[PDB]
Amino acid sequence: MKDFTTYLSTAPVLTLLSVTVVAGLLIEINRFFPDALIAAF
Amino acid sequence: KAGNWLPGSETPAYLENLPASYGFDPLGLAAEPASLARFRESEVFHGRWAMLGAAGVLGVEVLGYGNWYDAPLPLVQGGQATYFGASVPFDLGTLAAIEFAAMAGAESFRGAAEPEKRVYPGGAFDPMGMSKGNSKELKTKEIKNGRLAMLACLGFAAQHAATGASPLEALASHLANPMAVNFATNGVSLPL
Amino acid sequence: ATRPLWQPGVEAPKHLDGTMPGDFGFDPLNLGVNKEALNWYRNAELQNGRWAMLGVAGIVIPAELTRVGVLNVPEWAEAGKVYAESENAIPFASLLMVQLFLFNFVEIKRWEDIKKPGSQAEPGSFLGFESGFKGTGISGYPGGAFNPFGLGNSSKEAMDDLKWREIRNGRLAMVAFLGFLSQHAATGKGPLDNLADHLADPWGANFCSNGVSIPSALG
Amino acid sequence: DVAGLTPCSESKAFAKRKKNEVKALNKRLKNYEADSAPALALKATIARTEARFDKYAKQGLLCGTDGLPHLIADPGLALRYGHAGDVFIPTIGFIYFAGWLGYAGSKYLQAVAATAKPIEKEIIIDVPLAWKLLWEGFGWPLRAFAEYKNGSLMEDDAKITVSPR
Amino acid sequence: AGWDLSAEVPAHLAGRKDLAGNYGFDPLNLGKNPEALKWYQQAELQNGRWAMLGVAGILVQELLHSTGLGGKAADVYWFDAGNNTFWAPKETLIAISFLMFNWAELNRMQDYIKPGSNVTDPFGNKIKYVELGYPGFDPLSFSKNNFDEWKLKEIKNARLAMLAFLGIVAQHNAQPGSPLEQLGAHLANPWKNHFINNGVSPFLTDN
Ligand SMILES: CC1=C[C@H](O)CC(C)(C)[C@H]1/C=C/C(C)=C/C=C/C(C)=C/C=C/C=C(C)/C=C/C=C(C)/C=C/C1=C(C)C[C@H](O)CC1(C)C
Ligand SMILES: CC1=C[C@H](O)CC(C)(C)[C@H]1/C=C/C(C)=C/C=C/C(C)=C/C=C/C=C(C)/C=C/C=C(C)/C=C/C1=C(C)C[C@H](O)CC1(C)C
Ligand SMILES: CC1=C[C@H](O)CC(C)(C)[C@H]1/C=C/C(C)=C/C=C/C(C)=C/C=C/C=C(C)/C=C/C=C(C)/C=C/C1=C(C)C[C@H](O)CC1(C)C
Ligand SMILES: CC(=O)/C=C/C=C(C)/C=C/[C@H]1[C@H](C)CCCC1(C)C
């Protein structure tokens, strides 16, 4: 189990997971808050 | 000392031999000797100026010549300043310049003297020469009268800023109705 | 050391220990690792807490009196505008500049005190009043002129307790002011109005129904 | 109006653009049923287009002669005319998030640089440490300013390798 | 243990037998700090004595208002004293009270700061000091013997009066009429009139 978690912590796996999480978060932000041209607060 | 300010308190030691000293210094502003000397001179000077101011404020009113608050009013909105029921031919600019020059010279000559001479300068300033012969009691009376006059001047200013009448009218109004005419009735001093 | 911590079971960071008032070992972001930075943050916390206490008092006490009936004052968010439309109202720019000019002098002097506590006590700096500008050794707690009644001067432990009470009240007032800002922005009502509305129906009147905290897009 | 720009609310070209886009969408919608999947998708697109145009006109954006929104990138000019949310506020937001990520990476690199084997820590990231540093990176402005005023945020020029000129 | 046979004295009250009414009651440990307990003792004495005077005044005024003895001034509820007219208005009386209380309370505070210091009047008259919370104002010399028993009576009556005032205020805010009228309304049944049916304390019952 330790070796598996160590493999999941490698640079490529972590890079792909981080990019996927960031892309998913951005996609959902644009899905619920679309066409945000300016920062209207 | 002759006094204790707070009957059961412990007055400071540096205020034990000074005249008109009640040990009043809870904030400890006279802990340093230099500050104490400067404050002593300032207190005596303030008392003298306040006594003169209170005497003038009462005199101009009891003599039916006008109030202290409206004294510079005729000069503004036109001109002409009255004195003793006469007329002085001077404007605000000339009056300010004359007073500035006279006061600047007097204070400059007074402030450049020795520390003791800056608050108690005998000689030419005592024509009657009554300073000699135990001046401690006289100094105490002077300081106390100055403190009372300072409080009186502050009272004139605050009372006029609150009610709006001059000293004599305020005194007469309070004497007429001492129960419903005081600082508690006006909607400024006591809010609730 | 063994004093209560913010999160029971979690050890306090070594950079905090337990000497500053209000020390509960709360620093998840490790912002106060540097000693100089920690000192500056301590002074900033004291200043923010005191100003927040004054503001929250000036916002709650007048509102409570107004609710009763005695002393009628406008709501804190409209107090600035109410005075603007007054007759002899001072211009906003001039008023702000005067306040900033006075605060410049006092705040710069306090700034010099932070760098060196006995800085303002330099002989001859003022007209004999510099003697009362010497701190107590810790920036942010200046006796002399301040603290005229001498509260907490009986002993060192008495002053420590008062410091803890001051820090807790300051933090509570800071959180309260942030709540006031958020409540007024979310609901155009006063703090007392919000409290009264919540007690009437807590499950139907709270931040989950104001329409601002929870975005309508998600629902 | 800032530089000869007309607000999108009173812009005729903006309204014409919205009308044309909705018209094209309805023309495409006319070739389907009333409750079919393509019809529902086209109706949703029409609603989104109308909402977008209404929001742009309501937000106070400035439109040019072409009828498209224009952004004002100048403090003062955008602050006094109510356009701070065009570039100013987004600039602050970016700078904050960018500094957060950069500070988290810097702290992680400096923390693992003290380990006996830092290269492995670079190819095999320490998830718990990275998570803690990512959380700590949110206070990056305060930490960065403190390190700058402390002198620990910089390396002495005499300690950095340099070319032989 | 005095207030609860199953409880234990909070240690800070076990070695304090000089305190009037010491029953080891401090579940919140508010008096753990010696200075805090010293201040709380004076606060308790002040609150108790003021409560005794206030409760006695309210009870006597209501008794005269119900039975009928006092003039038009007494024939009014205690909370309605503002409707009456006296020699001076409310503001003047309030200001006079503030000044007199400032003088008396500052004398008391000076004594608290240093017991036995402020005990002399400006005319030289002196009195014998007997403990902090007991300045010695005993013109009848009742403290010459059984001082502990007398102070125990005082502390118990003071606590009872404090509770009585709190109850009077609560009843006024929940029930109509004067305290004596509320007592009579209770004694009328008394199985129905007892805060449970007042519609204010339970709140959950009938809104
Ligand atoms: C000591 C201490 C210490 C501690 O520790 C702390 C503490 C507390 C702070 C303290 C205290 C303090 C105090 C009390 C103060 C006060 C002061 C004053 C009041 C002054 C006045 C003062 C005052 C003054 C000078 C005044 C003056 C006046 C005058 C000139 C007048 C004039 C005039 C006249 C004639 C008339 C005319 O027609 C008008 C005029 C023109 C107007
Ligand atoms: C600790 C820590 C550490 C870790 O590591 C991290 C973290 C987590 C981040 C942290 C936390 C933090 C926090 C919480 C903060 C907050 C703060 C605040 C809230 C402040 C305020 C603060 C606040 C303040 C000052 C305020 C003040 C106020 C005022 C003056 C007011 C005023 C007013 C008045 C009177 C009235 C009128 O009519 C109006 C006005 C004008 C309005
Ligand atoms: C001990 C402890 C400890 C542990 O650990 C914890 C715990 C549990 C918390 C505790 C407990 C506590 C408590 C219970 C407290 C309470 C107190 C009170 C009640 C006070 C009152 C107190 C009260 C008081 C002062 C009162 C006073 C009153 C008075 C003056 C009155 C006056 C009057 C009169 C004559 C008549 C008229 O027509 C009206 C008036 C003008 C109104
Ligand atoms: C307003 C302005 O521009 C200058 C004012 C100067 C003063 C008061 C100087 C006063 C003295 C002091 C305290 C030191 C020695 C010289 C003086 C005249 C006695």
What DSSP string describes B36-71? HHHHHHHHHHHHHHHHHHHHHHHHHHHTTS--SSST
| Paired strand residues for B88 | B81
Residue B108 CA, closest ligand 4 atom number:
18
Distance of CA D131 to the CA centre of its chain: 23
D145 within 8 A of A34, measured Cβ to Cβ: no
The closest ligand to the CA of D139 turns out to be 2
- Cα(B147) to ligand 4 centroid in Å equals 25
Put simply, whether B33 touches C (Cβ < 8 Å) is no
Q: Quick one: which H or E segment has residue A26?
A: helix A11-32
Closest CA to C121 of C105, C109, C106, C108: C109
What are the CA-CA distances from residue E12 to residues C134, C156, D157, E2, E43 (Å)? 39, 21, 64, 14, 18
Q: Residue D63 in 3-state DSSP? A: strand
The amino acid sitting at D150 is N
Helix axes E34-63, E147-174, angle to 10 degrees: 60
D6-7: strand order across its sheet: D6-7, D62-63, D69-70
- Comparing alpha-carbon positions, the chain B residue that sits nearest to E113 is B9
Phi-psi category of residue B64: left, alpha or beta, with phi > 0 → left and psi -120 to 50 → alpha: left
E118 within 8 A of E110, measured Cβ to Cβ: yes
Within 10 Å of residue E118's Cβ, how many Cβ atoms?
Answer: 22
The structure was resolved experimentally with cryo-EM
What are the CA-CA distances from residue B24 to residues B30, C1, E99 (Å)? 10, 44, 20
Which chain E residues are closer than 8 Å to C161 by Cβ?
33
Of B27, B34, B191, the CB nearest to C128: B34
Rounded to the nearest 5°, which phi and psi values hold at D70?
-125, 145
Which chain D residues are closer than 8 Å to C26 by Cβ?
none
Alpha helices (H) in chain E, listed in sequence order: 34-63, 90-113, 147-174, 179-188
Within 10 Å of residue D87's Cβ, how many Cβ atoms?
Answer: 18
Task: Kindly list the protein residues whose Cβ atom lies closer than 6 A to any atom of ligand 2.
Answer: C 26-29, 31, 48, 51-52, 54-55, 58-59, 76, 79, 174-175, 177-178
Virtual torsion, Cα B45, B48, B49, B50, nearest 10 deg? 120
CA triple E112-B190-B176, angle to 5 deg: 115
- Cβ neighbours for E59, distance < 8 A, ≥ 6 positions apart: E179, E180
Q: Residue C71 in 3-state DSSP? A: coil
Q: For this experimental structure, what is the resolution in angstroms?
A: 2.7
Buried b (16+ CB within 10 A) or exposed e, E30-51: ebeeeeebeeebeebbeebbeb
Closest CA to D45 of D74, D24, D17, D14: D24
What is the radius of gyration, based on Cα positions, of chain C? 22
Q: Quick one: which H or E segment has residue D70?
A: strand D69-70
- Cβ neighbours for E185, distance < 8 A, ≥ 6 positions apart: E175, E177, E193
Encoding tokens for residue E183?
């007592």
- Cα(B41) to ligand 1 centroid in Å equals 14
Encoding tokens for residue B104?
């600047």
- Cα(E26)–Cα(E20) distance, integer angstroms: 14
- Cα(D38)–Cα(C149) distance, integer angstroms: 80
Alpha helices (H) in D61-139, listed in sequence order: 77-80, 88-112, 118-123, 127-136
Give me the sign of the Cα torsion angle B43, B44, B45, B48. positive
Cite the annotated binding site of D for chlorophyll a by residue number.
74, 80
- Cα(B66)–Cα(B71) distance, integer angstroms: 7
- Cα(B8) to ligand 3 centroid in Å equals 30
CB-based burial of residue E93 (10 Å sphere; 0-12 exposed, 13-18 middle, 19+ buried)? Answer: middle
C218 within 8 A of C91, measured Cβ to Cβ: no
D63 within 8 A of D14, measured Cβ to Cβ: yes
D and B touch with 3+ CB pairs <8 Å, answer: no
- Cα(E13)–Cα(D106) distance, integer angstroms: 58
What is the radius of gyration, based on Cα positions, of chain E? 21
Distance of CA C166 to the CA centre of its chain: 10
Q: Residue C90 in 3-state DSSP? A: coil
Closest CA to D140 of C80, C29, E154, C47: C29
Which of B46, B73, B88, B156 to mutate to test ligand 1, by most ligand atoms within 8 A of the CB atom? Answer: B46
Encoding tokens for residue D137?
């990176």
Residue showing tokens 């290269």: D119
CB-based burial of residue E27 (10 Å sphere; 0-12 exposed, 13-18 middle, 19+ buried)? Answer: exposed
| Paired strand residues for B81 | B88
Closest CA to B167 of B49, B60, B75: B60
Rounded to the nearest angstrom, the minimum Cα separation between D165 and chain C is 38
Rounded to the nearest 5°, which phi and psi values hold at E120?
-110, 135
The amino acid sitting at B152 is A
Residue showing tokens 């904050």: D96
Enumerate neighbours of D (3 or more CB pairs within 8 A): A, C
Distance of CA C85 to the CA centre of its chain: 29
- Cα(D73)–Cα(E49) distance, integer angstroms: 72
Residue showing tokens 């009437």: C200
What are the CA-CA distances from residue D47 to residues A35, C198, D40, D50 (Å)? 13, 37, 10, 5
C143 within 8 A of C135, measured Cβ to Cβ: yes
Put simply, whether B31 touches C (Cβ < 8 Å) is yes
What are the CA-CA distances from residue C44 to residues B87, C50, C139, C170 (Å)? 61, 10, 11, 12
B152 within 8 A of B171, measured Cβ to Cβ: no
Alpha helices (H) in chain D, listed in sequence order: 12-29, 37-58, 77-80, 88-112, 118-123, 127-136, 140-150
CB-based burial of residue B114 (10 Å sphere; 0-12 exposed, 13-18 middle, 19+ buried)? Answer: exposed
